[PDB]
Design a protein around this nucleic acid. Structure first.
Ligand SMILES: [Mg+2]
Ligand SMILES: [Mg+2]
Ligand SMILES: [Mg+2]
Ligand SMILES: [Mg+2]
Ligand SMILES: [Mg+2]
Ligand SMILES: [Mg+2]
Ligand SMILES: [Mg+2]
Ligand SMILES: [Mg+2]
Ligand SMILES: [Mg+2]
Ligand SMILES: [Mg+2]
Ligand SMILES: [Mg+2]
Ligand SMILES: [Mg+2]
Length: 231
RNA sequence: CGUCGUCAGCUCGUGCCGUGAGGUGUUGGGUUAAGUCCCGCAACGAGCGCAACCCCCGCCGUUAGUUGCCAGCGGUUCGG
């Protein structure tokens, strides 16, 4: 499922803004830039996917996290397809570590979904209409992919582990295994199942996350063909 | 009951940080009479206060017309 001209898409980046634990996954340093050994990226995509596979055919949830502008939209796409939860926007603190309390805020999300599905009163004072709606958009704005999550995931997939160290931390505290794509600005040992590739190119984020979803649906019940990529 | 003080404040739940007292939230940019609301944030909510809900005066309408009122008619001892 794997493809080999990811060279055509990503082969990493970043200058000496590195982390030296990532040494093992590195070929050489060219444009004043850390260049990732693709043959290692390979050994790993495999091992990661083997983990990814076993998780779909047992029907286990995956939490998708990425909020840097690059991976922002493409997680709303690729995760919706597998219908699995995500946070695209802001990563609220304690989403895993304080799940039951965070979630007590989705019942509020649902409660507005009902209360706005009419009527249950519109003789509620005018501003109160306007007020509650604003709240609705707000919840929707962060929680739109989170609600799908009704229990702690059996695993989580992250786009930037550094950028989302909080996430990685919360998972790790819970024993929730962490899969992530990650370039040289990151700490390897911190990831269980790892994709050493560029994490800032919309090209790259695209290849890696898509084939993930494609591998999810394929061993889940079905197969599908192409899904949206911004040119 | 006074008072600080009608001052915008004081907490809590769970999460997180710290060996610990404790921190965070409640800080931060803007805005407000105000922890008033906005945005941002390892926090997310909740409580008591703020506010609002009550009384008063200011505008109008309705329901009422005596012991209250008198615009027009009629008288009128000259006092609706
Ligand atoms: Mg990066
Ligand atoms: Mg606490
Ligand atoms: Mg200390
Ligand atoms: Mg502790
Ligand atoms: Mg405390
Ligand atoms: Mg305070
Ligand atoms: Mg404090
Ligand atoms: Mg301030
Ligand atoms: Mg005041
Ligand atoms: Mg308040
Ligand atoms: Mg705040
Ligand atoms: Mg009051």
């Amino acid at each position: 499922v794997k493809e080999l001209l990811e060279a055509g898409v990503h082969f990493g980046h970043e200058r000496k803004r590195w982390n030296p634990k990532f040494a093992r996954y590195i070929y050489a340093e060219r444009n004043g830039i850390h260049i990732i050994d693709l043959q290692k990226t390979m050994e790993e995509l495999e091992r990661t996917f083997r983990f990814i596979e076993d998780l779909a055919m047992r029907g286990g949830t995956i939490l998708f996290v990425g909020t840097k502008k690059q991976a922002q939209d493409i997680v709303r796409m690729e995760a919706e397809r597998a219908g699995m939860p995500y946070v695209n926007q802001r990563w609220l603190g304690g989403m895993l570590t304080n799940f039951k309390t965070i979630s007590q805020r989705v019942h509020r999300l649902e409660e507005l979904e009902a209360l706005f599905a009419s009527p249950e009163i519109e003789e509620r004072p005018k501003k109160e209409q306007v007020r509650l709606k604003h709240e609705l958009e707000r919840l929707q704005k962060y929680l739109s992919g989170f609600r799908l999550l009704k229990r702690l995931p059996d695993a989580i997939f992250v786009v930037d582990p550094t950028k989302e160290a909080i996430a990685v931390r919360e998972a790790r505290k819970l024993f929730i295994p962490v899969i992530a794509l990650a370039d040289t600005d990151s700490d390897p040992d911190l990831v269980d199942y790892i994709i050493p590739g560029n994490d800032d190119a919309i090209r790259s984020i695209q290849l890696i996350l898509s084939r993930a979803v494609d591998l999810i649906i394929q061993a889940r019940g079905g197969v599908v063909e192409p899904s949206p990529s911004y040119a």
